[PDB]
CSV table of C-alpha atoms and ligand atoms in Angstrom, one decimal:
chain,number,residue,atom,x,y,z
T,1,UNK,CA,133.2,85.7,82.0
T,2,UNK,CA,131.3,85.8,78.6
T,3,UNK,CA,128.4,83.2,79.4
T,4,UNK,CA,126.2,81.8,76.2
T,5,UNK,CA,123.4,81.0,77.0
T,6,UNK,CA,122.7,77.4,75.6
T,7,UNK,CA,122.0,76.6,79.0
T,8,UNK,CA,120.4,78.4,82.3
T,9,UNK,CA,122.9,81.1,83.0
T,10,UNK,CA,123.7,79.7,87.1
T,11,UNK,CA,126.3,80.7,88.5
T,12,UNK,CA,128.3,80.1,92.2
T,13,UNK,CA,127.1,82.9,94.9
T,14,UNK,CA,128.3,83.6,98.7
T,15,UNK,CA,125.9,84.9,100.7
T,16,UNK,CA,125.5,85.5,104.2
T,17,UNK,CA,128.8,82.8,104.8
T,18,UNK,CA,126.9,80.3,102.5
T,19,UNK,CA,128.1,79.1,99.2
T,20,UNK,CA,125.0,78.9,97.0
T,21,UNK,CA,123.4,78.7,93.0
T,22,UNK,CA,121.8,81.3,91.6
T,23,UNK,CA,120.3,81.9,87.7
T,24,UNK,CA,121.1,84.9,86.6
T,25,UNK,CA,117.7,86.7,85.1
T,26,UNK,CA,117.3,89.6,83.1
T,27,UNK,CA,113.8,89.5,83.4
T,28,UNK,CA,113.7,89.5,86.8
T,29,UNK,CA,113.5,93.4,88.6
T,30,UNK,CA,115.3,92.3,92.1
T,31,UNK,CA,116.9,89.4,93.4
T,32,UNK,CA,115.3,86.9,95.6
T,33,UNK,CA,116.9,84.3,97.2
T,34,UNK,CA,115.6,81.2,99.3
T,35,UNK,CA,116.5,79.6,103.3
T,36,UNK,CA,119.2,83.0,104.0
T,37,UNK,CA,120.0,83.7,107.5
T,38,UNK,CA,121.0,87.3,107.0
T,39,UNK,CA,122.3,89.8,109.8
T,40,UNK,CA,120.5,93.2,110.3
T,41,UNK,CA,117.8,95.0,109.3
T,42,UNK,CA,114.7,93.9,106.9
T,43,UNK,CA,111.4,94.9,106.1
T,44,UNK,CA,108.4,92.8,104.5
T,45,UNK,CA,107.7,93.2,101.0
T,46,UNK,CA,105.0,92.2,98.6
T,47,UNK,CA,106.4,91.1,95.3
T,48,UNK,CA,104.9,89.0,92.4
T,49,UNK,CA,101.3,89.9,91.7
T,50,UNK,CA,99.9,87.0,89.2
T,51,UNK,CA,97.5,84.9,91.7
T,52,UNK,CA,98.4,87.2,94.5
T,53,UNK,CA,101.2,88.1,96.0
T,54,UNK,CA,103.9,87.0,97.9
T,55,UNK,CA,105.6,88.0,101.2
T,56,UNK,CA,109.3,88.4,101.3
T,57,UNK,CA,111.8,90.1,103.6
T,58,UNK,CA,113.7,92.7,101.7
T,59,UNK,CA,117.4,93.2,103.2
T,60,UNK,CA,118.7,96.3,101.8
T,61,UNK,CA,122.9,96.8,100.8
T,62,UNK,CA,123.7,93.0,101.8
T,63,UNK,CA,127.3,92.3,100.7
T,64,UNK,CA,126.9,89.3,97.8
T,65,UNK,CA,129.6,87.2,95.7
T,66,UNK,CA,129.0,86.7,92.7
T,67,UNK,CA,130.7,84.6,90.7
T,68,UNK,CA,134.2,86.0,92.3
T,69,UNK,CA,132.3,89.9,92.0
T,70,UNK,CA,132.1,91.3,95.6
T,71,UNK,CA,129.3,93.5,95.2
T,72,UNK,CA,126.6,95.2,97.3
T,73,UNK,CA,123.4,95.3,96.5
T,74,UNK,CA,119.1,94.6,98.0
T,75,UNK,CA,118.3,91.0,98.5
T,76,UNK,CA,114.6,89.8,99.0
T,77,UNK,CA,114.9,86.6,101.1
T,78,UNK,CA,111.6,83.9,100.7
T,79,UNK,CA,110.0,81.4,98.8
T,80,UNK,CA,111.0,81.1,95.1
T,81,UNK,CA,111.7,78.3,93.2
T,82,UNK,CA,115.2,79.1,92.2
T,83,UNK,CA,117.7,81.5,93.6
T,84,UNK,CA,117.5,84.2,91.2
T,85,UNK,CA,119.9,86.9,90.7
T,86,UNK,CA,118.0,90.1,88.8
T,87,UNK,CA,119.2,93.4,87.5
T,88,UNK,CA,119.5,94.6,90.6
T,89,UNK,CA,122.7,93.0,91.1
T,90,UNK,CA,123.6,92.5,87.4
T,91,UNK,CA,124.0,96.0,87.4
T,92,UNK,CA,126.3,96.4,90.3
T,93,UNK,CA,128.9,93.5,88.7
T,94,UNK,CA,129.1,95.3,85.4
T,95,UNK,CA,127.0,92.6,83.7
T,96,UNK,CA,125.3,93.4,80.4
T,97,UNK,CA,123.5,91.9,77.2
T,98,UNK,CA,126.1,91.6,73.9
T,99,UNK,CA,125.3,90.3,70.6
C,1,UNK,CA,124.2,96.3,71.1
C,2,UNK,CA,125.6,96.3,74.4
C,3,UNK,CA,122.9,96.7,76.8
C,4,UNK,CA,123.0,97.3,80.3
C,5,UNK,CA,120.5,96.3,82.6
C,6,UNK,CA,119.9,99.6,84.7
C,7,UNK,CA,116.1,99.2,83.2
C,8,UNK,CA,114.2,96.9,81.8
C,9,UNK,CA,116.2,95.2,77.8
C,10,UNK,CA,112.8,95.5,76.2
C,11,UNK,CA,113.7,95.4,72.4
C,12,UNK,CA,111.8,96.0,68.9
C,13,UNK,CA,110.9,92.6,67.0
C,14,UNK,CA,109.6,91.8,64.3
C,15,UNK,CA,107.6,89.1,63.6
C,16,UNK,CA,104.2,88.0,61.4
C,17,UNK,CA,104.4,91.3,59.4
C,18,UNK,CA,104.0,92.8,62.9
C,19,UNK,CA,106.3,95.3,64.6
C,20,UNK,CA,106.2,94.4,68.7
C,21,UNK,CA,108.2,94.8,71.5
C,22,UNK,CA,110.0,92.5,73.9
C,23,UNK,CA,112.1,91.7,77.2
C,24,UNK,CA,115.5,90.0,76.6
C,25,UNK,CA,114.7,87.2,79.4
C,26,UNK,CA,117.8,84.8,80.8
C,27,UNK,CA,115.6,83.3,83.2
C,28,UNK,CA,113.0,82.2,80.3
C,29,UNK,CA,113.9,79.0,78.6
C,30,UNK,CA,111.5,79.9,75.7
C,31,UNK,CA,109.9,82.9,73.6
C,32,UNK,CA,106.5,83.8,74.4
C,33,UNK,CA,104.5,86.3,72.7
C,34,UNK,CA,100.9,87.7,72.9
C,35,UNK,CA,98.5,88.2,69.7
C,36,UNK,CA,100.9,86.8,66.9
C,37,UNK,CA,99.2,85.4,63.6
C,38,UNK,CA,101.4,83.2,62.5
C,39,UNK,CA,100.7,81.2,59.4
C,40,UNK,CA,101.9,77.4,58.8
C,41,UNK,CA,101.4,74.2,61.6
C,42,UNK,CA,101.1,74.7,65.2
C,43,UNK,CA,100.6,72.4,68.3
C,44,UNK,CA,99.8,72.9,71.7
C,45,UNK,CA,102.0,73.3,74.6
C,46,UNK,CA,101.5,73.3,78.5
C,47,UNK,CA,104.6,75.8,80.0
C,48,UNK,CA,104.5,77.3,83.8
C,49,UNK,CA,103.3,75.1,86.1
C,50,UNK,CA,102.9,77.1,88.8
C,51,UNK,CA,99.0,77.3,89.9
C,52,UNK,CA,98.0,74.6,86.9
C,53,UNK,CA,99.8,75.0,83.5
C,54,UNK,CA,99.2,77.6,80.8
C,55,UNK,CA,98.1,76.9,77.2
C,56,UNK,CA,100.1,78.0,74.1
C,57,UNK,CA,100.6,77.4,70.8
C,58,UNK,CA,104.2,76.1,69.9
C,59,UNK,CA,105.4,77.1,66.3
C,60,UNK,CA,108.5,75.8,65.2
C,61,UNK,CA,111.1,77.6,62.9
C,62,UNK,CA,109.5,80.8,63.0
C,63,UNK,CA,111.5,83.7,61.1
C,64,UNK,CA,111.8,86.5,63.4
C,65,UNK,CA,113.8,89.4,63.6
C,66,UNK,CA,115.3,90.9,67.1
C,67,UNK,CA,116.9,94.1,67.3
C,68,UNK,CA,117.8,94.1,63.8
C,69,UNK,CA,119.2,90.0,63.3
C,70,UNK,CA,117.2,88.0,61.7
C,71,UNK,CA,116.9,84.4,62.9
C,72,UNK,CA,114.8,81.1,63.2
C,73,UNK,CA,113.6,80.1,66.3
C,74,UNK,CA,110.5,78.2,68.4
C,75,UNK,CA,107.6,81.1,69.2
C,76,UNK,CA,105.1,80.1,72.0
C,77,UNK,CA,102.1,82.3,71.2
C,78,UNK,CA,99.7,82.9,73.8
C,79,UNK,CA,98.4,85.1,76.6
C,80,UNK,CA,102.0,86.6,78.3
C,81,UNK,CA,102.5,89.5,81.0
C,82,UNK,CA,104.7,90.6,78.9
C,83,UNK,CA,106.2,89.7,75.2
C,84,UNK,CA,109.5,87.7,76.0
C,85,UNK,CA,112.4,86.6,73.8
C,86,UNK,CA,113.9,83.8,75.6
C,87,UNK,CA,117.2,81.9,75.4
C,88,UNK,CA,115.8,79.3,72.7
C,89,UNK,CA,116.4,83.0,70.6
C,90,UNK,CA,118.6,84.6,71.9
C,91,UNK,CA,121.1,81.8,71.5
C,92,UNK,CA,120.2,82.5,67.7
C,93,UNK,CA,121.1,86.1,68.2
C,94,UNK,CA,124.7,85.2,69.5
C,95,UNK,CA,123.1,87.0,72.8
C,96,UNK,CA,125.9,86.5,75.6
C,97,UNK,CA,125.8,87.7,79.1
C,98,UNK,CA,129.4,89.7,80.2
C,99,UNK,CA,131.0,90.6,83.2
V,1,RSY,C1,104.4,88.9,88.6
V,1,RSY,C2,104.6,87.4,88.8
V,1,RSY,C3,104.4,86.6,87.5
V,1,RSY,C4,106.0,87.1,89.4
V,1,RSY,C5,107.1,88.2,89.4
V,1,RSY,N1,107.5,88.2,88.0
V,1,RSY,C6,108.6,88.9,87.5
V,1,RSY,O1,109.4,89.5,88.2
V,1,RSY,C7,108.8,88.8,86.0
V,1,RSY,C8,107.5,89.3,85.3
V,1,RSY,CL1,106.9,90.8,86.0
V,1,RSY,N2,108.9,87.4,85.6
V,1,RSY,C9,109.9,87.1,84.7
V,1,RSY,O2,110.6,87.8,84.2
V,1,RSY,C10,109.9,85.6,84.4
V,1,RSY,C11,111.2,85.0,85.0
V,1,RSY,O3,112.2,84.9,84.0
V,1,RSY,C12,110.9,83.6,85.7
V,1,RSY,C13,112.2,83.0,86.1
V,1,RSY,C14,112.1,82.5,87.5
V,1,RSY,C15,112.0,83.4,88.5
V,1,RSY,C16,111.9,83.0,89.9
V,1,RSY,C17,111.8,81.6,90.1
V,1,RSY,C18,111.9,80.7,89.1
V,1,RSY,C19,112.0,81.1,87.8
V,1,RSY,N3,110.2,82.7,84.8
V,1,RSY,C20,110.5,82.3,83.5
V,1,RSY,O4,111.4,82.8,82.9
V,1,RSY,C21,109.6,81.3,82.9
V,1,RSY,N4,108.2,81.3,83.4
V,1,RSY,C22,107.1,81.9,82.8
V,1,RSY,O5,106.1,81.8,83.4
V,1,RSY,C23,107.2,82.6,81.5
V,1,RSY,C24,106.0,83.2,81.0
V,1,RSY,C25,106.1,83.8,79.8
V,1,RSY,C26,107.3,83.9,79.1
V,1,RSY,C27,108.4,83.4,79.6
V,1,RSY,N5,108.3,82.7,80.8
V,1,RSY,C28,110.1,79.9,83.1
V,1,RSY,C29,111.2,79.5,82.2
V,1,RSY,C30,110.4,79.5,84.6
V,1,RSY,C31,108.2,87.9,90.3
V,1,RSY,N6,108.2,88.6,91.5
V,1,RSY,O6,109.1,87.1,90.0
């Protein structure tokens, strides 16, 4: 798709069997996800930084939809606001900036 | 430009007579910069709202150029991370996301 971006860039994600939302974020390094019941292995991971840090579980090559793009690709699994989809996975759909 | 998103799209703007540079951000709703003197009216804004709210000055119809277009656009000036060009510009821009 080409998506302006009059409004937040969300798209439709499946994830570990779940259908979810997800804003697709540019500024955003990795993609972190909230409430995922993932299979296999993890490790903990310190992200953010601004008021200290925060602890997530980082699930390396997790197969991800998004929006119909079956792609694989590290997911960080904890607390965040919104589902956020970051170049990361951006990159592994093919998705890039145009103007 | 097409830009892929293997690093960082952190692009040159320019903006009060200044040359600066900034991060192409989906996930912002806004442009933020750091130590911009703008001339003409001002008021304050609170954005974030995580951990209390932040500050900034909100100028409105602010010529700016970004990556070579020049446009019109809302600049938030105060203390940022990082200098980010939001939608609210890159909507200006004709900025799409494509996959
Ligand atoms: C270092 C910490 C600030 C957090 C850390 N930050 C980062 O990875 C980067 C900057 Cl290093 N942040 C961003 O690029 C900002 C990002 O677009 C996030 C989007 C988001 C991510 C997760 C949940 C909810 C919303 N925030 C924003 O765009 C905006 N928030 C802001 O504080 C903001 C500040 C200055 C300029 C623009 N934006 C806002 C519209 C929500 C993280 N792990 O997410």
């Amino acid at each position: 798709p080409q998506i302006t971006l009059w409004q937040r860039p969300i798209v439709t994600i499946k994830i570990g069997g779940q259908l979810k939302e997800a804003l697709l974020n540019t500024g955003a390094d990795d993609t972190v996800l909230e409430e995922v019941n993932l299979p296999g292995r993890w490790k903990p991971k310190l992200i953010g930084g601004i008021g200290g840090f925060v602890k997530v579980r980082q699930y390396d090559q997790v197969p991800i939809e998004i929006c119909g793009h079956k792609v694989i690709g590290t997911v960080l699994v904890g607390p965040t606001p919104t589902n956020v989809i970051g170049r990361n996975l951006m990159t592994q759909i093919g998705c890039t900036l145009n103007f």
